[PDB]
Amino acid sequence: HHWGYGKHNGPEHWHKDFPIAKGERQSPVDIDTHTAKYDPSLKPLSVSYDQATSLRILNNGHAFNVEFDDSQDKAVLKGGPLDGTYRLIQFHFHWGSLDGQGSEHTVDKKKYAAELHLVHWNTKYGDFGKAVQQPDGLAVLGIFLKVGSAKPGLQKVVDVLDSIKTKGKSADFTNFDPRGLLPESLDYWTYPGSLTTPPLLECVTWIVLKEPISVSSEQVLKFRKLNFNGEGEPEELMVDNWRPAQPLKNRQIKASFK
Template structure:
């Protein structure tokens, strides 16, 4: 069992014993109250240019389902919104619950959704991904909330049909020709704030862009995610669920959204 996972077994409230940053002042996720959000006229729309050919593999890490993208050059990028430059897409991660009433990390107006997709991008003005983690503007994460409903978005299907192939921890299969922008809701409005990764070491390098409108998934689709095991193939099945971090204090941070 690798060291970091052993630490995580202690649970999020003890991560800081190994990763002191987890007790920092700018941690994520946070609860967002619409009435307290600052409508900022300076905030622009965001744009993505994703190359479907950049998608490489999909993996069960034992903690999440992860899609990896080729980030060796500006192949799939995010720009605009609160960002100063162009950020490269590196990975897609999913958080979900054991039941439909929990699973998302960010909570908006006291609503916690069934899941949350994170598209992780980094700022290539820094020499590499590891270097970007040490800078407050090094990473931009686009968050898409998942809510359970009657008309599921067919777009999740592509990811979910791979669940059989990555049942157990450490399983990884090729995942080609995938454009994550199909996951975006119609409404492009967003909340943004400065925060951290929601997994150790919880580096405080993230500009969060949380899309206000959730996308709809079905009960069956959520069950597919919950069918993954957090254990390796030879070990007993252990449902990979509730891989979301509890809320962190907002402290003096401001959550902003564009005026339009």
């Protein structure tokens, strides 16, 4: 029926409705650190989020999205392996039922507790919908979360989850600064890949940060209280909404550092 993360509609079944699931540039992947090639020609990333305008937070039934105003060049990503400017449209997370799983990308097979995706689209394409149809339409910044100390900047997000508990619920969410979710270092790995949920389009340049951010056990606990179901349906907690690693095939992972 419709896709999800269960036994009957889970990642292993997506190919029936989205044949691109078995494509040549699917994400996520395992990052083998000893096989990644340092490329001295990659430039430092440029994150300009000082003018970011958040608008809303929504439970879409597969995760929660924080959405931003992308009608102008307010929060953009450039540099790194990118040509052109990419505007931030939304961020979302992927997490586990336990602290030992939850990320989509893995590092030398290590799984993190969660993974944050900051989604950006190439301005040359005019809108998000046109950008997903192009090989270089999107740039996603992935950041791993490990459990340790609390991340102060994530607390405003944690506190509004009670209000968007079930599918289709949304809440006003203005004045959130995504700079509070960045690690100290911007060192990264990069490879050409895809969206990690249907429609799984191969239009992403992935930018995976080497340095994880830490969140407290209590912070991650609140994510696991969300629901997949809609209001008044039998309760199914929103946990394990991650797609396992896909074959690298003909691709190279490059590193910005040695």
